[PDB]
């Protein structure tokens, strides 16, 4: 059994946030929701589809029907920024299942698109029989990005290491991604690419061993 959530939702302060959790016949199950504020342990914000535990603001509301459970947050405030997860229990497999989570950003500034800088391996590193491509990503908001690498036209998933975003002094975000290769790999392709996706738009930089 699989539960589907959007990886991110952005909302202006005071507006209403809706976070969905899709699952076939999820309406039959009871859905609980967690809020995981940055660096804090998960807490329960909605239980049994639509109940609120004590302490939780009345702005937090839940709904569950058919194939979709929804967490609704009215009059959202900055303090509501967090990752939200739905969870159910699947009786057929005796498993607890979490959705993939939703990052909720409460927009404190306009959206900002990332700048991407891509460095090829240094000749010094190649001499040490290693090769690392360095993809530096900066000045973006909200602080969520996905990075994909390519060798020529083909996706590369092995040897990829990517950081979580970190807030800069200008209150925008930075992250970095690294691709490790053998010198032989680096030399035997025509090019490699770092593709950065942010808010459905993509920036791709390419480097070549030549």
């Amino acid at each position: 059994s699989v539960l589907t959530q959007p990886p991110s939702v952005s909302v202006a302060p005071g507006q209403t946030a809706r976070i969905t959790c899709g699952g076939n016949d999820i309406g039959r199950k009871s859905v609980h929701w967690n809020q995981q504020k940055p660096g804090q342990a998960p807490v329960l914000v909605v239980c049994y589809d639509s109940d609120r535990p004590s302490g939780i603001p009345e702005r937090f509301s839940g709904s569950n029907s058919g194939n979709t459970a929804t967490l609704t947050i009215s009059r959202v405030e900055a303090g509501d920024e967090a990752d939200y997860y739905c969870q159910v229990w699947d009786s057929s497999s005796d498993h607890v299942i979490f959705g993939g989570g939703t990052k909720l950003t409460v927009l404190g500034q306009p959206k900002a698109a990332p700048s991407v800088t891509l460095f090829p391996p240094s000749s010094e590193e190649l001499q040490a029989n290693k090769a690392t491509l360095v993809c530096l990503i900066s000045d973006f908001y909200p602080g969520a990005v996905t990075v994909a690498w390519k060798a020529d036209s083909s996706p590369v998933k092995a040897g990829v290491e990517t950081t979580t975003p970190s807030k800069q002094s200008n209150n925008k975000y930075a992250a970095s991604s690294y691709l490790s290769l053998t010198p032989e790999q680096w030399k035997s392709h025509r090019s490699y690419s770092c593709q950065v996706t942010h808010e459905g738009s993509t920036v791709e930089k390419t480097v070549a061993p030549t």
């Binding site: 229990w89 498993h95 989570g101 700048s115 991407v116 690392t132 990517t162 970190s166 690294y178």
Partner: protein, 226 residues
């Protein structure tokens, strides 16, 4: 009040086992399930299984059954999770959580999670103090504003955190951007530091990144040239 107190950070070699603990207070340990849930860095919550401390009965998720083991010691109100044959995918925060949400209906006879522990961080790594290798990132103007160039230093494969980077012994601070390190699958860190400078300065001004990894008593002054 209800608390679950978890054991501290561990750094473990590939192939080893780790056994983390979860001690319950503020309620009667045998009254509720203990669930285990892990979270790899930047990723989602993943349920591992539960144990009922009264009966001792376990329910392992398919993905974890048979290379992890859940137990408990009711004399000290403590639940344990042992993870075997560690690999890089096992680098994660391991949470315990109480099954305090009683079922309301026999048709959905499930005890949901209410109170969570703070998590135990497990890093799978070669684990020894290790100094970095430092490589130059040669100047490029492709992605910077007009008339400027970015040059940098790649600081590779060190443990533990942190490494510090300055430029020209601190005389250069404008335009410096040091990116926080990534923890690689190897269990070693890498980071990059780049500075943006006038392109006309390149044939003339010398740029040196000053790298310091105190845990390994390593310092590197790397000249970065066009």
């Amino acid at each position: 009040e209800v608390q679950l107190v978890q054991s501290g950070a561990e750094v473990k070699k590939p192939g080893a086992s780790v056994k983390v603990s979860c001690k319950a207070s503020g309620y009667t340990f045998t009254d509720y399930h203990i669930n285990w849930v892990r979270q790899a860095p930047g990723q989602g919550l993943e349920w591992m299984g539960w144990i009922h401390p009264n009966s001792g009965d376990t329910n392992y998720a398919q993905k974890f059954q048979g290379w992890v083991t859940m137990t408990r010691d009711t004399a000290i109100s403590t639940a344990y999770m042992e993870v075997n044959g560690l690999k890089s995918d096992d680098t994660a925060v391991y949470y315990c959580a109480r099954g305090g949400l009683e079922p309301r209906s026999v048709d959905y006879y499930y005890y949901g999670m209410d109170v969570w522990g703070q998590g135990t961080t497990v890093t799978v790594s070669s684990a020894s103090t290790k100094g970095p290798s430092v490589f130059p990132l040669a100047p490029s103007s492709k992605s910077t504003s007009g008339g400027t160039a970015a040059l940098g230093c790649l600081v590779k494969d060190y443990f533990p955190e942190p490494v510090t980077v300055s430029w020209n012994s601190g005389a250069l601070t404008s335009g410096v951007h040091t990116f926080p390190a990534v923890l690689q699958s190897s269990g070693l860190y890498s980071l990059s530091s780049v500075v943006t400078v006038p392109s006309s300065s390149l044939g003339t001004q010398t740029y040196i990144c000053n790298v310091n990894h105190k845990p390994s008593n390593t310092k590197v002054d790397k000249r970065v040239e066009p």
